[PDB]
Amino acid sequence: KSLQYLGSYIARAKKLSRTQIIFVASYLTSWLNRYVIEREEEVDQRGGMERFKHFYAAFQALCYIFCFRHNIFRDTDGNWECELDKFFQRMVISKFNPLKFCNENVMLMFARIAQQESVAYCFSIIENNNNERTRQQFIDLQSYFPYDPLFLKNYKILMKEYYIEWS
Amino acid sequence: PQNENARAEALNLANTDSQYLTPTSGSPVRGLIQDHISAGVWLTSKDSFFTREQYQQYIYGCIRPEDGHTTRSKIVTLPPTIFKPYPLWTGKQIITTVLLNVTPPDMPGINLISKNKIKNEYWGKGSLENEVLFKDGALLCGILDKS
Amino acid sequence: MIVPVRCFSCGKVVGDKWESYLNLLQEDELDEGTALSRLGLKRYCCRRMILTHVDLIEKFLRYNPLEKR
Amino acid sequence: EEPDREKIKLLTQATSEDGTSASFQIVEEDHTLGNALRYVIMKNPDVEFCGYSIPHPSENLLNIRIQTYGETTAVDALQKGLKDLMDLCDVVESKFTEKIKSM
Amino acid sequence: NTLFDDIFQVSEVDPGRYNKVCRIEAASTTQDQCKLTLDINVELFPVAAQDSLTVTIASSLNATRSWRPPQAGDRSLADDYDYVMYGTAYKFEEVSKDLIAVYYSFGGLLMRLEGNYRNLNNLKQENAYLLIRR
Amino acid sequence: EWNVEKFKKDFEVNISSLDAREANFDLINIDTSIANAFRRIMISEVPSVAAEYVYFFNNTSVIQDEVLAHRIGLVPLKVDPDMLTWVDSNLPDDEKFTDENTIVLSLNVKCTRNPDAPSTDPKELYNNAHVYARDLKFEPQGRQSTTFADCPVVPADPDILLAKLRPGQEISLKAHCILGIGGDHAKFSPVSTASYRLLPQINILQPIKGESARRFQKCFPPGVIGIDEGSDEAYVKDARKDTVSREVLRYEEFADKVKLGRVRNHFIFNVESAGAMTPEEIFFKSVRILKNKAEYLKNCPITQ
Ligand SMILES: [Zn+2]
């Protein structure tokens, strides 16, 4: 929940610096510089992906930034901060198949964004999940977002600026 | 019962499985009683010739990995006892299968010599269906009874 | 009490063939082996029911308090 | 728009990773289609194991278990059987309509 | 491969309280100190008295992992011989010298050979077939 | 491999005797688990109309409340299904029974003292003494009149006695038809008995010519064995005519000359009917319930 709480703090807060959002990706993506060495080797051991519900918890939140923060990290020279259009290519085409263990709605939005700006081309592997596929604790927390657009119309007077709108 | 010092006792001390032998003279008190005992001398009889589709069905009807009875996490079958005309299984080979599949794989098979209450002459010319002989976890000879 | 409506085993309708059954006995002097048979009862589950039926409703109807005497 | 996702309920704790040994638990069933499907699954030569079970006859339960040899998951052998349980009723009706109309 | 091969001569076909299984008894024509005491499913394979068997015990067909029922196009050692079982030898015994008399349990169908040179090539392997031609 | 289009070349149907209450038809070369499943539907899963709900207004008679409530429910009401829809009884009475699920019946019978002259019969001594079940009157509720102009509700067996009444007693109740199936209650059975039996096969072993042929008739039902002489010593005319008696396996002279046993692939389905529907169409309400019991598995998401 805290890796889900952290994911929606960053993409729903307006007064944080653009060098402070890379500070998340200085450690959250660096957390994926640690799973790539250590625990990419238990999958060939006879075991499913039910043990890695901690791992796909935070991996949702990094794609939850990517579904929102897209027009922030341009430069003039046509690059991205630590190759943003190359990091989500590597950790999806691995031998973990995150397309099934991420939600469809969060992959409906990971696909249209990675088609316009040419980030990922996992579309034919999104299509390859009908012949590839207890359970309730992995669908709700891939849909519970702690900073939802609030039903209360009155408290948003105090939070018109410090809470981000859709776009 | 109402707390956890007692729920462990009802699972470890005074449960049914530890009360298999009587504490009087060590005789057993569990066991099938009327239906299956006289039923079992028909499946273990020599004329039991199951076909292919029945053989898994009598196995799967008593063994379910879904409810979690097995140890191997997959129901394994044996080769039939007739090959060339029409492949038929045998009921002694069913008791061979249900000893294969609820017993742990780390230990090897069973070996047992035992008698019956059926005297040998009831089956014809002096055949040996009184001597119930288990070897390597198989019902190789003998019919299963109250004994 | 009265004739049962369906047979207790098969599921064929029985109750319309009880007062239509005594009119093969009080009149034609038939035996039950033809009297049950001429109606249509031909399974013995539904042929030990019209034969056997006690019909004690008549001994109840003599006890009516909704009538003078 | 409504899926009834409670009929073909696939238990997973007795399921192979590759899907060649699947595990169901079918409600609104008993020996009705339990043995009508078990006959038709076992005609598929790829199927290695198919029994249907009932844990307790009181409620509606039908644990069936397909296991295959290779190159076909057990759910892909289920849906051949339910395709060949329907096509039987194509045969039976047009060989029983063709005899009522033939007298 | 083949462990044993002979031709026997049926004398007794005991019906004996069964509807399908008859305890056959026979002895050979080639050798004389060798016999048979075999249960066969006489429903599938009718055996009367005064006949000629061919009791050939093989060790496999011509390691394979899984027994699967036959596909269309293979070739087996069981192709030519009309009735094939499977069983283990569960007891070895010798009556005297060159009168060694083995046992078997062909699935719950007891067999008893007896002889002198079969000590060479009948181990108590858990995979040992049985075959009959003609 | 077993093709299902080889199954069509090994599936024949011999309809023997087709009547509007029973049909006796054959199923050649089908399985004891497919042909059971047809028989498994025709008792239970076929829909048939009866009455669960008996609203008494007035009844003072001898046959009490729940008993005559019971015996109305056992009446096969000649109501064709697919002209009602299914109730949805998860909500209370205000919209539970509609004008489209429920057919509504009423009973009004009053018995009086009829003066008549002579041991005296009860039909002439009283006016309306015996509550026959042709006294059930269809109340057309709602719009059940623009389309019931050729299918009015009549009970299928009208002469069912329901109660016997004495003067003073009356029965006033209101009955509600419910569309049901024969797993819940027996009273929704669409059949008398839809059972099959299986074709026996009698094999002579030794030729039984002469005196062994003439005494061989009396072991069997008659229209089965045909014996003439030494030539035409015996044969079987039709074993379908022969129920399984096994009288011949009492005789010691014949206990080794013959073989009795079924042909395992010739199902003689003889489906009768209670009266609600024809047997030769409730069998079509089992060749199309099976076909629509597979689509509820097939076109359905395999959960988890
Ligand atoms: Zn009956």
Task: Give a verbal description of the structure.
Chain E: This is DNA-directed RNA polymerases I, II, and III subunit RPABC3. Chain E: Its main location: nucleus. This is part of a larger assembly, with chains A (167 residues), B (147 residues), C (69 residues), D (103 residues), E (134 residues) and F (304 residues). Chain B has 147 residues and is α+β, with helices and mostly antiparallel strands. Helices cover 24% and strands 10% of the residues of chain B. Chain B contains four helices and five strands. In chain B, β4 and β5 form a beta hairpin. Chain C has a single domain, classed as Arc Repressor Mutant, subunit A (Orthogonal Bundle). Chain C has two helices and no strands. With 103 residues, chain D is α+β, with helices and mostly antiparallel strands. Chain D is built from four helices and four strands. In chain D, the strands form two sheets. Chain D has a two-stranded antiparallel sheet with strand order 1-2. The longest helix of chain D has 11 residues. Chain D is globular. Chain D starts with 7 loop residues before the first strand and ends with a helix. Classes of the chains: A mainly alpha (167), B alpha+beta (147), C mainly alpha (69), D alpha+beta (103), E mainly beta (134), F alpha+beta (304). Chains D and F meet through β1, α1, α3 and α4 of D and α1 and α7 of F. The site of zinc ion has 7 residues of chain C, from loops.
Can you lay out the helices and strands and say which pair or pack?
This is part of a larger assembly, with chains A (167 residues), B (147 residues), C (69 residues), D (103 residues), E (134 residues) and F (304 residues).
Chain C: H1 32-39, H2 57-61
Chain D: E1 8-11, E2 23-26, H1 31-41, E3 47-53, E4 63-68, H2 74-81, H3 83-93, H4 97-100
Antiparallel strand pairs in D: 1-2, 3-4
Helix pairs in contact in D: 1-2
Chain E: E1 2-4, E2 8-14, E3 21-28, E4 35-41, E5 55-58, E6 83-87, E7 104-105, E8 110-111, E9 128-132
Antiparallel strand pairs in E: 1-5, 2-3, 3-4, 5-9, 6-9, 7-8
The complex binds zinc ion.
PDB class: transcription
Keywords: RNA Polymerase I, Pre-initiation complex, PIC, Open Complex, OC, Core Factor, CF, Rrn3, transcription, DNA opening
Entry title: RNA Polymerase I Open Complex conformation 1
Termini separation of chain D comes to 46 Å
Please state the CA-atom Rg of chain D, rounded to the nearest Å: 16 Å
Q: Which ligands appear in the coordinates?
A: zinc ion
Largest interface, with Cβ-Cβ < 8 Å?
D-F, 42 and 40 residues
Q: Which architecture of chain E per CATH?
A: Beta Barrel
Strand order of the largest sheet of chain E: 1-5-9-6
